[PDB]
Here is the input.
Amino acid sequence: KTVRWCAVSEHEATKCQSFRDHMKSVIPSDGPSVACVKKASYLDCIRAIAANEADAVTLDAGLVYDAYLAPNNLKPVVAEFYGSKEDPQTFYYAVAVVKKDSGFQMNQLRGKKSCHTGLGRSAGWNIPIGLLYCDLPEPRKPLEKAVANFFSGSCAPCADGTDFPQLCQLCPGCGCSTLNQYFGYSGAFKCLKDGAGDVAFVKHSTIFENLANKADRDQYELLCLDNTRKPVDEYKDCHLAQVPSHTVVARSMGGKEDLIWELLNQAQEHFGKDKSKEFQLFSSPHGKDLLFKDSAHGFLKVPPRMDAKMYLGYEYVTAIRNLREGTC
Here is the structure.
């Protein structure tokens, strides 16, 4: 009945010990219980779990990918959802928004200008650049220069514009802060709305956050991997990658997922959003996003026998592998 959670820092351990202590204060010992393990990094927790030294850890998508790999063979078991119970979000979609009828598809991106949320961000850089990897003109290493060589001018916040200036052409300096009008989520969208670039690599919610009505959203379009375009509302059938926000992983064999979901469900019921004032699962006096993201609403039980690469999606896996392996 004891689930050994892995923390990757001292605040997470403290929060874990407190979570544990409150759970004991509300459940019959025949119920699920927490044990707090403390590691130095997500990868050290992944290894501990595989090594039967811990049972569960919640991770972002790239780490879910790593945990899956051998010798780890960890698998997704529970997800954090957001938004609502009716319409619970567990994923975000990396999309490629463009101006209506700007006459080019995903496979025709070479020679256009790009707006990225920031270099190194998943939806804004990793996912799209990973997907386009082999389209980039060689020499492909260093990647920054190749990207600069693929687009006629870009805005890649946090890029080394001293060495690859073309990357800041749309935002001189590639300022890695909001001091740069083209930084982050709204920044990249503004870059395209302003007509500075042809395409904006952002997540689906971004355009909805920046545009009032359908009419507004209708001057825009999304590029689909099948080299066709579709309305922005259709992002679910037209995205670069469907990415899980935060996923709990456990050993594929002997992971105790059964008990893990029990603890987490009984956890959400007892101290989920609004449920408790003595203990809050999605906050902590000790820090932001300790163990679970603070913006989480609860958990959903992930589909039975859900292989990681299936949970991540063929595209995401392709992107990561391209960026890691550089094989073409």
Q: What stands out?
A: Residues 42 and 63 are 7 Å apart (CA to CA). The first helix runs from residue 10 to 24. The longest strand covers residues 74-83.
